[PDB]
Amino acid sequence: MNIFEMLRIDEGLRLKIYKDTEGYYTIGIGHLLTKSPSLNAAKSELDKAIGRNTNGVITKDEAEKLFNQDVDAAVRGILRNAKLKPVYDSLDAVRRAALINAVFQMGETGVAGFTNSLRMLQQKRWDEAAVNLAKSRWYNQTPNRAKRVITTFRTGTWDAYK
Numbered sequence: 001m002n003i004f005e006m007l008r009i010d011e012g013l014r015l016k017i018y019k020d021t022e023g024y025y026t027i028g029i030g031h032l033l034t035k036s037p038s039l040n041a042a043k044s045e046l047d048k049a050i051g052r053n054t055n056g057v058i059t060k061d062e063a064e065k066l067f068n069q070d071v072d073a074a075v076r077g078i079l080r081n082a083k084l085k086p087v088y089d090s091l092d093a094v095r096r097a098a099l100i101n102a103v104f105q106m107g108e109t110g111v112a113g114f115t116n117s118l119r120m121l122q123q124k125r126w127d128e129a130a131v132n133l134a135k136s137r138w139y140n141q142t143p144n145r146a147k148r149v150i151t152t153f154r155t156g157t158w159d160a161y162k
């Protein structure tokens, strides 16, 4: 199991523009296109991301390319973030993947806002961090996914994905 397989499971793969859990235009493997309510805006952003006139449809290869880019951007964002880098550096490999997952889903800023949880992860207080992370909109809106990520931080293994 690895970060790629992990996010492929949580985000799925769709080759046509679709709406995410929040109602935003998305494509591929969780690649957010725009927060704008307009499909055209979405099509415009897609074309600009792929580099061709896409008609709102892409290929598997294209979806994987966006995916590679997005994972890469997520890692780089953590490393450049003052609040995140220290947490990430303190973690083992499995838990690092779980932090990447969260950033991918909610953005660097979003994750950085979980001050208290961040402190608990850094101190290695697994069970306590897990309880605190559950007290969030994130968990109430996407409970199955949040539970998987949270278990990953609690145990340090991939059991939730197996």
Ligand SMILES: [Cl-]
Pocket: 049
């Ligand atoms: Cl892009």
Ligand SMILES: [Cl-]
Pocket: 141, 142, 143, 144, 145, 146
């Ligand atoms: Cl869910």
